[PDB]
From a paper:
Lysosomal integral membrane protein 2 ([name]-2) is encoded by gene [name], and is also known as [name] ([name]; refs 1, 2). It has N- and C-terminal transmembrane helices (being a type III membrane protein) and a heavily glycosylated 400 residue luminal domain (bearing nine potential N-linked glycosylation sites). The most notable function of [name]-2 is that it serves as a lysosomal sorting receptor for β-glucocerebrosidase (β-GCase), deficiency of which causes Gaucher disease, a lysosomal storage disease in which glucocerebrosides accumulate. [name]-2 binds to β-GCase in a pH-dependent manner, and dissociation occurs in acidic late endosomal/lysosomal compartments.
Human [name]-2 luminal domain containing residues 28–431 was produced by stable expression in HEK293S (GnTI−) cells and crystallized in two space groups, C2221 and C2, at pH 6.5. X-ray diffraction data were collected at the Diamond Light Source, and structures of both crystal forms were determined using the molecular replacement method based on the model of [name]-2 at lower pH9 and refined at 2.8 Å resolution. The electron density maps for both space groups are of good quality with only 11 terminal residues disordered with 29 and 30 glycosidic units well ordered in the two space groups. The most surprising observation is that we can identify from the well-defined electron density that the sugar attached to N325 is P-Man9GlcNAc2, the first time this sugar, which bears a terminal M6P, has been seen in a protein structure. The D3 arm of the glycan arches over the side chains of H150 and R153 that cap helix α4. The phosphate attached to O6 of the terminal D3 mannose is stabilized in the C2 crystal form by capping the N terminus of helix α5 via hydrogen bonds to the amide groups of R153, E154 and I155. Although our two structures at pH 6.5 are almost identical to each other (root mean squared deviation=0.3 Å for all Cα atoms), they differ significantly from the pH 5.5 structures (root mean squared deviation=0.5–0.6 Å), with the largest difference occurring in the helical bundle of domain II, which includes exactly the region (residues 150–167) identified as the β-GCase binding site. In contrast, at pH 6.5, the helical bundle is very well defined and similar in both space groups. At higher pH, the α4–α5 linker (residues 151–152) folds towards α7, such that α5 tilts about 20° towards α4 and α7, making the bundle more compact and further stabilized by the C-terminal cap of α4 formed by His150 and Arg153. In contrast, H150 caps α4 at higher pH and seems more likely to act as the trigger for the markedly altered conformation of α4 and α5.
Author numbering: 37 to 430
Amino acid sequence: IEKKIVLRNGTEAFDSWEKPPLPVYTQFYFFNVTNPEEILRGETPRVEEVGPYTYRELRNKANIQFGDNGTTISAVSNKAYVFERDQSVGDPKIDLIRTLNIPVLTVIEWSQVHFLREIIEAMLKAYQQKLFVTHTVDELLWGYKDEILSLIHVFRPDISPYFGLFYEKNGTNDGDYVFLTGEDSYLNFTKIVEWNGKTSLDWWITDKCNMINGTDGDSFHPLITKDEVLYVFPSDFCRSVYITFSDYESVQGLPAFRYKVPAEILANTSDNAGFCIPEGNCLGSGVLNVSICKNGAPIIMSFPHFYQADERFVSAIEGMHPNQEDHETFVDINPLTGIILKAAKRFQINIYVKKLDDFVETGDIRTMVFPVMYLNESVHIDKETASRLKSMIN
Ligand SMILES: *[C@@H]1O[C@H](CO)[C@@H](O[C@@H]2O[C@H](CO)[C@@H](O[C@@H]3O[C@H](CO[C@H]4O[C@H](CO[C@H]5O[C@H](CO)[C@@H](O)[C@H](O)[C@@H]5O[C@@H]5O[C@H](COP(=O)(O)O)[C@@H](O)[C@H](O)[C@@H]5O)[C@@H](O)[C@H](O)[C@@H]4O)[C@@H](O)[C@H](O[C@H]4O[C@H](CO)[C@@H](O)[C@H](O)[C@@H]4O)[C@@H]3O)[C@H](O)[C@H]2NC(C)=O)[C@H](O)[C@H]1NC(C)=O
Ligand SMILES: *[C@@H]1O[C@H](CO)[C@@H](O[C@@H]2O[C@H](CO)[C@@H](O[C@@H]3O[C@H](CO[C@H]4O[C@H](CO)[C@@H](O)[C@H](O[C@H]5O[C@H](CO)[C@@H](O)[C@H](O)[C@@H]5O)[C@@H]4O)[C@@H](O)[C@H](O[C@H]4O[C@H](CO)[C@@H](O)[C@H](O)[C@@H]4O)[C@@H]3O)[C@H](O)[C@H]2NC(C)=O)[C@H](O)[C@H]1NC(C)=O
Ligand SMILES: *[C@@H]1O[C@H](CO)[C@@H](O[C@@H]2O[C@H](CO)[C@@H](O[C@@H]3O[C@H](CO[C@H]4O[C@H](CO)[C@@H](O)[C@H](O)[C@@H]4O)[C@@H](O)[C@H](O[C@H]4O[C@H](CO)[C@@H](O)[C@H](O)[C@@H]4O)[C@@H]3O)[C@H](O)[C@H]2NC(C)=O)[C@H](O)[C@H]1NC(C)=O
Ligand SMILES: *[C@@H]1O[C@H](CO)[C@@H](O[C@@H]2O[C@H](CO)[C@@H](O[C@@H]3O[C@H](CO[C@H]4O[C@H](CO)[C@@H](O)[C@H](O)[C@@H]4O)[C@@H](O)[C@H](O[C@H]4O[C@H](CO)[C@@H](O)[C@H](O)[C@@H]4O)[C@@H]3O)[C@H](O)[C@H]2NC(C)=O)[C@H](O)[C@H]1NC(C)=O
Ligand SMILES: *[C@@H]1O[C@H](CO)[C@@H](O[C@@H]2O[C@H](CO)[C@@H](O[C@@H]3O[C@H](CO)[C@@H](O)[C@H](O)[C@@H]3O)[C@H](O)[C@H]2NC(C)=O)[C@H](O)[C@H]1NC(C)=O
Ligand SMILES: *[C@@H]1O[C@H](CO)[C@@H](O[C@@H]2O[C@H](CO)[C@@H](O)[C@H](O)[C@H]2NC(C)=O)[C@H](O)[C@H]1NC(C)=O
Ligand SMILES: *[C@@H]1O[C@H](CO)[C@@H](O)[C@H](O)[C@H]1NC(C)=O
Ligand SMILES: *[C@@H]1O[C@H](CO)[C@@H](O)[C@H](O)[C@H]1NC(C)=O
Ligand SMILES: [Cl-]
C-alpha cells in the first residue's frame, strides 16, 4: 500500500507538489517567413524553422489553504522562465523573426465582431500597417508596444498597448485552483475540482465539452494501470484532454508507462463538434480554434507541423514537415507512484488568416491556418533523485 502519496502537511508528496524539485524546460521554435510579399499576392507561404530558445522554469504553489479538513486544497501555480543562452540557438534579444502582425489581425477580428469597430477602423485607415512584421524573439514572447494598440489605449485604458505570446506570464499563475488531495481516495489525487471558483467551463457548446477532467498535468494518481485512460486539464489549451497508453519505457532504473495524446483528441468528429463554435463547424482534423479564450484573437492551436492533422494543412504551408519522433506529445509515468519521469509536452500556435476586401492589409492572401511558433515543455529525472526514489520506493 502507498498512502504515502497524499497531499498533507508533513509528507514529501506535499513538499514536492508545493515546491517541485525537478527542473522543467520550455524550448520555443519559431517559423520565420521567407516570402511575405509573395504571400500577399496569394502565393504559397514558405517558412523556416528557427530555434530552440530554451528557458528553465521556476515553479511553486502559493496561497495554499487546506479545505474540508484535508480533502480539498486551494492554491495558485506560479511559474517563471530563466533564459539559458548556451542551450539555445542564439540570443532572443537580438534574433529577429519575421511573421504575422498579430495585434492588427486581432483588432480586425474585433472590428468584424463589432467590438470597437469604428475606433479600430479609423486608426488602421489613418496609420497604414504591414501584415508581416519583424521583431526580436524576446519581443514576440514577452511583449512589445504596438502602434495600433497604443492608439486604442488612449481611448480605452482597459486595452493593453503591449502584446506578446507570453505577455505578463512570467512570475504569475493561471488562476485560482482548488485541488483534490488523495485523502478521500488515492485515485482522486491532485485532481481538479474548480478553477476561478467554477467547477466547469462555459465557452464550449456541450456540457460534456465544458467539463474539467483530470489533474493540472504535472503529476498523477498512484498505481496506474496500462488499461486506463488519463485525463488532464491544461488551462492554456482551453479544454480538458485525455492521454492513452502507448508502450513500455525505462527511465533510469524506474518502470514507466508511455502515455501519448491520441489523434481522437483533435479529430473532425461529431464528438469534438462541440469545440467548433458557433454551429459545430470544424476546420478539419488536428487543430483547435481558441479565439474565445484568447480574447477574440484568431488563434488556432495545433500540434507541431500539423502532426496528426489533415494533410491539406501541411500542404498549405511550405516548410511543414511533421514526424512523430520530433513532434508528438508524450509523457513517461512511473506506474507505481503516478509520478512523471520524462515528458515532452509539445504544441503549436497558429493564426487563421484570410483575404478581406474592406482591409487592403490582407492583400490577396490565401485562407489558411498560419503557423507562428511551437514549443516543447520537457522534464527528465536525474540520477540522484531517481535512485533516491528507487530506494525510497523499497
Ligand atoms: C473561431 O471561434 C470564434 C468564437 O468561438 C468565432 O467567432 C464567432 O463567429 C463569428 C466570427 O465572425 C461571429 O459571428 C458574427 O458576429 C457579429 C457580431 O456579433 C456581435 O455583435 C452583434 C451586433 O452588435 C452591433 O450591432 C447591434 C445593432 O445591430 C448593437 O446591438 C450592438 O451594440 C453593436 O453595435 C455596433 O456598434 C459599433 C459602434 O461602436 P464603436 O466602434 O465604438 O463606434 C458600430 O460600428 C457597429 O456597426 C454596430 O452598430 C450582436 O447582435 C451579437 O449578439 C454579437 O454581440 C455579427 O455581425 C455577425 O452577424 C452576421 O450575420 C448577419 C445576419 O443577421 C449578417 O447580416 C451580417 O452580414 C453579419 O456578418 C455574426 O453573428 C461571432 O461573433 C464570433 N464570436 C465570438 C465570441 O468571437 C470564429 O469565427 C471562429 N473562427 C473560425 C476560423 O472558425
Ligand atoms: C522572469 O522572472 C524571473 C524571476 O524574477 C527572472 O529571473 C531573474 O531575472 C533577474 C533580472 O534579470 C536576474 O537578476 C539579474 O541577474 C543577472 C545574472 O548575473 C549574476 O551574476 C552576477 C555576477 O556578474 C551577479 O552580480 C548577480 O547577482 C548576484 O550577486 C548579488 C550581490 O552581489 C546578489 O544579491 C544576487 O542575488 C546574485 O547572487 C547575478 O547572480 C545580473 O547580471 C543582473 O544584474 C544586472 O541587472 C540588474 C537589473 O535587473 C541591474 O540592477 C544590475 O546593475 C545589472 O545591470 C541581475 O541581477 C535574476 O538572476 C533572475 N533570477 C533567477 C532565479 O534566475 C527572469 O529573467 C524573467 N524572465 C523573463 C523572460 O522575463
Ligand atoms: C528571419 O528572417 C529575417 C528576414 O529574412 C532575417 O532578418 C534579417 O536579418 C538580416 C541579418 O541576418 C538583417 O541584415 C542585417 O542588418 C543589420 C542592420 O541593417 C541596417 O544597418 C546597416 C548598418 O549596419 C545598414 O547598412 C542597413 O542599410 C540597415 O539599415 C546590418 O548591420 C547587417 O549588415 C552586415 O551583414 C553582413 C554580415 O552580417 C555583411 O554582408 C554586411 O556587410 C554587414 O556587415 C545585416 O545586413 C536584416 O535587417 C533582417 N531583415 C529584416 C526585414 O528584419 C532574420 O535574420 C531571420 N532570423 C534568423 C534567426 O535567421
Ligand atoms: C523537445 O522537442 C524538440 C523537437 O520538437 C527536440 O528537439 C529535437 O530533438 C530531436 C532529438 O534529438 C532532434 O532529432 C534529431 O535530428 C537530428 C537531425 O540532424 C541533421 O543533421 C545530420 C548531420 O549531422 C543529418 O544526418 C540529419 O539527417 C539531419 O539533417 C539528428 O541529430 C538526429 O538523428 C539521429 O537520431 C535519430 C533518432 O530519431 C535517428 O533517426 C537518426 O538516424 C540519427 O541517429 C535526430 O533525428 C531534432 O532535430 C531536434 N529539433 C530541434 C528543432 O531542435 C528536443 O530535444 C525535445 N526534448 C527535450 C527534452 O528537449
Ligand atoms: C470529461 O468527462 C467525461 C468522462 O471522461 C467524458 O464524457 C464521457 O464520454 C463517454 C463517451 O465516449 C461516455 O460514455 C457514455 O456512457 C453513458 C452511460 O452508459 C451513456 O449514457 C452514453 O450514451 C455514453 O455511452 C461517458 O459516460 C461520458 N461521461 C459522462 C459522465 O457522461 C467527457 O467527454 C470528458 N470531456 C472532456 C472535454 O475531456
Ligand atoms: C468534418 O466532418 C464533416 C462531417 O463529419 C464533413 O462534412 C461532410 O462532408 C461530406 C462531403 O465532403 C458530405 O457528404 C457530408 O454530408 C458532410 N457531413 C456533415 C455532417 O456535414 C467534413 O468533410 C469535415 N470537414 C472538413 C473541413 O474536412
Ligand atoms: C504547514 O507546515 C506547518 C504545520 O505545522 C506550519 O508551520 C505551516 O504554516 C504550514 N504551511 C502550509 C503552507 O500549509
Ligand atoms: C474522488 O474520490 C472518490 C474515488 O473514486 C470518488 O468516489 C469521489 O466522487 C471523488 N470525490 C469528489 C469530491 O469528487
Ligand atoms: Cl533515460
